[PDB]
Amino acid sequence: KEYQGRKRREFEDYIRRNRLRLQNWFQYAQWELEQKEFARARSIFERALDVHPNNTQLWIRYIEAELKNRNINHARNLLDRAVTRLPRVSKLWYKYVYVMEMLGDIPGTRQVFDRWMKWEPDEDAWNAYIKLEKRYGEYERARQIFA
């Protein structure tokens, strides 16, 4: 507990000293993840999201940190928040469809792709959606996607 308090003091002093550097938030949250303090790491990441709302790297690392501890529903809520805040960053959408294709869940991947197609993305996302529907048979729905 003395080591935990000293590390928390050092990390919070680095955060107070320069809050506009993402490495301090990343190190504090990863360290608090290492002692399995998931609520504390979530609080640190959400405070970093309060300081850096539109940082895609912080969103990616926080979704990844949520996923590697098998918190699926938390990370899916996080990906919903991330694609709500930054709908024009294709990296977040690509991670979101990749994660909900890795976990089975093909209608969920399809509705995420439907939201993405509602946002009218570039041709790469349309080709990815067509490849998704072509992989699991489903050619006629790919025909409406071409329409």
């Binding site: 002692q35 399995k36 303090e37 998931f38 609520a39 501890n69 918190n71 699926i72």
Partner: peptide, 20 residues
């Protein structure tokens, strides 16, 4: 998942954390 994280917090052991 909140309950599972609470359980993982209440049962953490700093024995295998020393090895990477």
């Amino acid at each position: 998942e909140i309950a599972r994280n609470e359980w993982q917090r209440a049962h953490f052991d700093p024995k295998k954390q020393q090895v990477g």
